[PDB]
Write an enzyme that holds these catalytic residues in place. Structure first.
Site, PDB file in Angstrom:
ATOM      1  N   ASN A 143       0.686  -1.531  -0.152  1.00  0.00           N
ATOM      2  CA  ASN A 143      -0.086   0.375   0.218  1.00  0.00           C
ATOM      3  C   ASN A 143       0.942   1.511   0.028  1.00  0.00           C
ATOM      4  O   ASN A 143       2.154   1.398  -0.244  1.00  0.00           O
ATOM      5  CB  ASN A 143      -0.974   0.081   1.463  1.00  0.00           C
ATOM      6  CG  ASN A 143      -0.165   0.493   2.149  1.00  0.00           C
ATOM      7  OD1 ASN A 143       0.991  -0.465   2.513  1.00  0.00           O
ATOM      8  ND2 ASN A 143      -0.428  -0.310   3.270  1.00  0.00           N
ATOM      9  N   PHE A 144      -0.004   2.076  -0.207  1.00  0.00           N
ATOM     10  CA  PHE A 144       0.684   3.735  -0.477  1.00  0.00           C
ATOM     11  C   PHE A 144       1.450   4.039  -1.310  1.00  0.00           C
ATOM     12  O   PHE A 144       2.644   4.534  -0.849  1.00  0.00           O
ATOM     13  CB  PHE A 144       1.826   3.612   1.230  1.00  0.00           C
ATOM     14  CG  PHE A 144       0.611   4.227   2.531  1.00  0.00           C
ATOM     15  CD1 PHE A 144       0.423   5.868   3.312  1.00  0.00           C
ATOM     16  CD2 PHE A 144       0.588   3.711   3.614  1.00  0.00           C
ATOM     17  CE1 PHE A 144      -0.322   5.615   3.404  1.00  0.00           C
ATOM     18  CE2 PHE A 144       0.352   3.394   4.943  1.00  0.00           C
ATOM     19  CZ  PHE A 144      -0.082   4.903   4.759  1.00  0.00           C
ATOM     20  N   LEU A 145       0.964   3.431  -2.188  1.00  0.00           N
ATOM     21  CA  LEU A 145       2.301   3.566  -3.806  1.00  0.00           C
ATOM     22  C   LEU A 145       1.387   5.336  -3.884  1.00  0.00           C
ATOM     23  O   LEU A 145       0.518   5.395  -4.130  1.00  0.00           O
ATOM     24  CB  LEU A 145       0.762   2.331  -4.440  1.00  0.00           C
ATOM     25  CG  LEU A 145       1.116   2.204  -5.895  1.00  0.00           C
ATOM     26  CD1 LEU A 145       2.131   3.189  -7.125  1.00  0.00           C
ATOM     27  CD2 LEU A 145       2.516   1.281  -6.614  1.00  0.00           C
ATOM     28  N   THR A 179      -4.403  -3.719  -3.510  1.00  0.00           N
ATOM     29  CA  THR A 179      -6.123  -3.083  -3.513  1.00  0.00           C
ATOM     30  C   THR A 179      -5.874  -1.524  -4.164  1.00  0.00           C
ATOM     31  O   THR A 179      -5.044  -0.938  -4.036  1.00  0.00           O
ATOM     32  CB  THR A 179      -6.799  -2.734  -2.009  1.00  0.00           C
ATOM     33  OG1 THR A 179      -6.458  -2.339  -1.024  1.00  0.00           O
ATOM     34  CG2 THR A 179      -6.803  -4.668  -1.328  1.00  0.00           C
ATOM     35  N   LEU A 237      -6.107  -0.818   5.083  1.00  0.00           N
ATOM     36  CA  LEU A 237      -6.743   0.487   5.486  1.00  0.00           C
ATOM     37  C   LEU A 237      -6.514   1.261   4.943  1.00  0.00           C
ATOM     38  O   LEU A 237      -7.178   2.224   4.089  1.00  0.00           O
ATOM     39  CB  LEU A 237      -5.888   0.997   6.684  1.00  0.00           C
ATOM     40  CG  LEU A 237      -4.204   0.348   6.456  1.00  0.00           C
ATOM     41  CD1 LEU A 237      -3.424   1.312   5.808  1.00  0.00           C
ATOM     42  CD2 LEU A 237      -3.934   0.156   8.179  1.00  0.00           C
TER      43      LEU A 237
END
Lengths: 392, 389, 392
Positions: free
Chosen positions: B113-115, B149, B389
């Site tokens: 995440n946090f891409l 996601t 998240l």
């Protein structure tokens, strides 16, 4: 009922230890080197205080380790530690000891291993090391073509076989009270409590005597016929049963396992029981330094088909309680497994706060009764639990 | 159903990062250095995103989101422009364990995440390169599957869920343009239609504590057997995600509650996390409080009062969020959420979320919406049992 | 009573050998290749020493192997060896031989197999290979659509058909004493003992002669009528019976099986008995190198319904004992199976320390009498044991 994973060969198993963050390294322990055994003892002493009073510590002797870790077929390769590279200090450990189980319902016999002594330094509790330890010891045993493992603990992992509850039978209440193990109930005095737990000084059953090497095959057959009633049990070769019932050294009475047999008027063994000793070191108490603890092990009786069965079992355990008095035992413990719930009430075992979960990795099994009500978690009297194995 | 790639060892994995255009360089972030964490916050604030809203990330939120047990600094991968050293892209991997219920497979993986990519570098198509590099780093640690996601449409998703919103403070949501006034409605009707009690209704409802961890965990494990993909936790892990990074301070990010009956037995539990939006260009408001439904479980799943009980649970969640400045309560159409969307007044949003499990084929899964209309399908269990998240 | 497993087809059986610890590999033996047979002999000689003295070793000849492993229908594929990959040395073995059993009470006939020659190198006793050997031989026979197997040995497992006890009848007491097999009783002398075991030099029964290929159908019919009294028996084709009673080679007198018949004046065969020879190599005795041993095999008599039955059986065995004297036999053994307990006492067979357990995998059967008291393990005189099969 059966294995879960698609099934592979030792070949398909990685040849080298899983990778660890650079600060650490795997270190196989050699417990035959007293310096390393000393390291393990220290790691456990300081950090393996699972769900125990902060003031208690497991007191492991050299004799206890021989018994617990060196049964026939034990492997040094399965004594897996983790060292911090900076200083070489031991900071985590996990072991696998060979064992054979049998699932009575499906009649399946499985050569496996018991995973225990999973210890992590208290400062490393946030490094998610347990799953790594389990993966690595599992890798090592898969390499030996063993694909099922038994693991037990208070931790909540997926699909437990079932859950049993701890029970305690005060032997020396006053001392248990002085150290904070037992509490004085509401309308009771220390005097009433002590009086309520007094026991004979001599065993009651005629023909009761300590088990010896010559009794091994007979007792084994007695246990085998008897344990048919549980869902999961343990099978032993005669050399293994001898080790677990009498100790690592054949020519010296064990101070760890106490095994007794009852032979009738005609010399035939009709019952037997065993328990092991594992004291706690006690901290911060001005009079006491140690707390003697016994743990019910394996047992079996003739009478399981007869009508005096319950009474006979309660008589057996009562004599176990009585014999423990000569070995410094202050509390006699057991879980709600096997047929233990048949004697808890009459023998005065009280329910404790601790619970034990059993996991059989890589294997589906039908639900099993744990000797307690699934919702209330209270003891259910005179019920046979599906758990017929006892793990140290 | 199973892995896709031929399977190799960490040894078969390139020991060094793959070179980027000469203008940039890889730069592993150390979020424990407030200066670097500040750099990440700025990169996200500006480039990770309606136009007038920005994710408001606190230091506490970051501890919770990026530092669960076992987190690795080596998995906080940034890209810096060589000329000035400015941070222009980032991607993270966090450890997570999934279980595919149908095939009874447990997989130690990672959530990606946090891409984030600077708006001016959107044409260099750096995303695939960020994914390849983080993937290389975890493959080196012997992890071979990952969950990712987002709204992006990549090859073959597990399924697709849809966002839902449950106004708590409609007037403010309207003031800031989040909520619109329906055709034949007034601001007054809307407000009235969303009023809620000020106190939770369920007896024995209280905040979860450290002592409830094992019990709640067992309850969630029994309960989540109904979904296709779920998450497994160690007790340290579960404790971190449900109660916060710091054990001796009530969390302002995750709110976890349990319901214990007349006998002190935990029968239900629910959790949700807070992630506000900073609001730009509004003369009245600067922040919009947002809550996201997290994990939950109930005794009653086998009983006949199941649906009513679930709706009672969520309703109390909605009520508790009022004390934490929540303006909208969100959730997706995953888990058994579609059992309470209608009675609890959750409206469908325009947003959709796709789930991707890289390097792993799985049977199709329900997303809580009709495959062609993309509309909510009531009282249906979704195959998605994990919340990211 | 009946099979245990749900029943499947050869199709449901895995087509390939089970996985092995990577150090080893499955290696089907070809006993027709004398080099391989030599390997098997060596593996056995060194490592198949369970339940016997350290100074004794089974002395297997080529003739003995032909007889034991090559009855009609034998399969090379069922001679399963294990080799250590490093050097290719044979380290373990297990065999399956076809055999047909009949359960007299339920009148069920079952084509099965006898699992024997399970041998593991002494240095691998800790690799836990036995279960793996059994599983793999079982897989191979399940592939041939056979679903039950008989296994015997001193090893203890849950639920054996029953247990029998070994018996010994000294033929050459002095030698059995020299090599340590027999001990001199408290108030006895080597001279008394020898005198107490002397036997005639010639058989007593009239019409007693060695069995021939001709007598097969008649003897077989006699055994069939006779063995109706046991619970489990063996059934043979005339070809199988010929092989087991007379040897692998039809045109050469066997040095392994000795079969005799008793016929009357008109060629009516009224009794018959057989026994097989399996010597021990003797180590560390300044005097003897070999110890001749005989084992009672199958027998039958006309007289079972008559009042002279017991006396007649005793006469039969006494002649067997006498005939063994011409084949170098030093001790004549038997188990407490069949009707053996009818002649142990009068024929002077003493109880040994050894016991034999029988297991019929994948089949539950009613309890069977083993010829000993279910509690004292002592011989119970003149009783019919449910065991009517003899395993080599």
């Amino acid at each position: 009922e059966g294995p879960i994973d698609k099934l592979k060969t030792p070949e398909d198993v990685p040849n080298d230890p899983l990778p660890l963050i650079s600060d650490f390294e795997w270190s196989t322990l050699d417990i035959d080197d007293n310096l390393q055994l000393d390291e393990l003892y220290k790691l456990l002493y300081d950090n393996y205080v699972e769900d125990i009073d902060a003031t208690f510590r497991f007191k492991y002797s050299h004799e206890f380790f021989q018994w617990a870790l060196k049964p026939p077929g034990w492997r040094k390769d399965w004594h897996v530690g983790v060292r911090v590279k900076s200083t070489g200090k031991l900071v985590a450990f996990i072991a696998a000891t060979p064992v054979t189980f049998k699932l009575n319902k499906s009649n399946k016999v499985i050569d496996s291993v018991e995973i225990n002594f999973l210890c992590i330094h208290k400062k490393l509790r946030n490094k998610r090391l347990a799953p790594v330890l389990i993966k690595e010891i599992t890798r090592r045993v898969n390499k030996q073509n063993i694909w099922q493992a038994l693991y037990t603990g208070g931790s909540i992992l997926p699909t437990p076989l079932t859950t049993c509850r701890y029970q305690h039978r005060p032997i020396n209440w006053s001392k248990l009270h002085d150290v904070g193990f037992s509490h004085l109930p509401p309308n009771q005095t220390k005097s009433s409590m002590v009086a309520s737990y007094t026991l004979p000084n001599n065993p009651k059953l005629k023909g009761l005597r300590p088990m010896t090497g010559k009794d091994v095959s007979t007792v084994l057959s007695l246990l085998y016929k008897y344990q048919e009633r549980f869902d999961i049990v343990q099978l032993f070769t005669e050399e293994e049963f001898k080790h677990w019932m009498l100790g690592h050294d054949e020519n010296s009475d064990s101070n760890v396992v106490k095994s007794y047999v009852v032979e009738d008027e005609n010399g035939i063994i009709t019952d037997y029981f065993s328990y092991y000793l594992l004291p706690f070191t006690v901290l911060d108490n001005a009079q006491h330094d140690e707390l003697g603890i016994a743990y019910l092990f394996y047992y079996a009786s003739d009478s399981f088909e007869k009508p005096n069965y319950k009474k006979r079992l309660n008589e057996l355990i009562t004599d176990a309680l009585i014999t423990s008095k000569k070995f410094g035992v202050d509390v006699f413990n057991c879980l709600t497994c096997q047929d233990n719930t048949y004697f808890l009430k009459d023998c005065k075992f009280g329910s404790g706060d601790g619970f034990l979960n059993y996991y059989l990795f890589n294997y589906r099994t039908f639900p099993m009764d744990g000797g307690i009500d699934k919702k209330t978690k209270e003891v259910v009297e005179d019920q046979t639990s599906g758990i017929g194995v006892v793990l140290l």
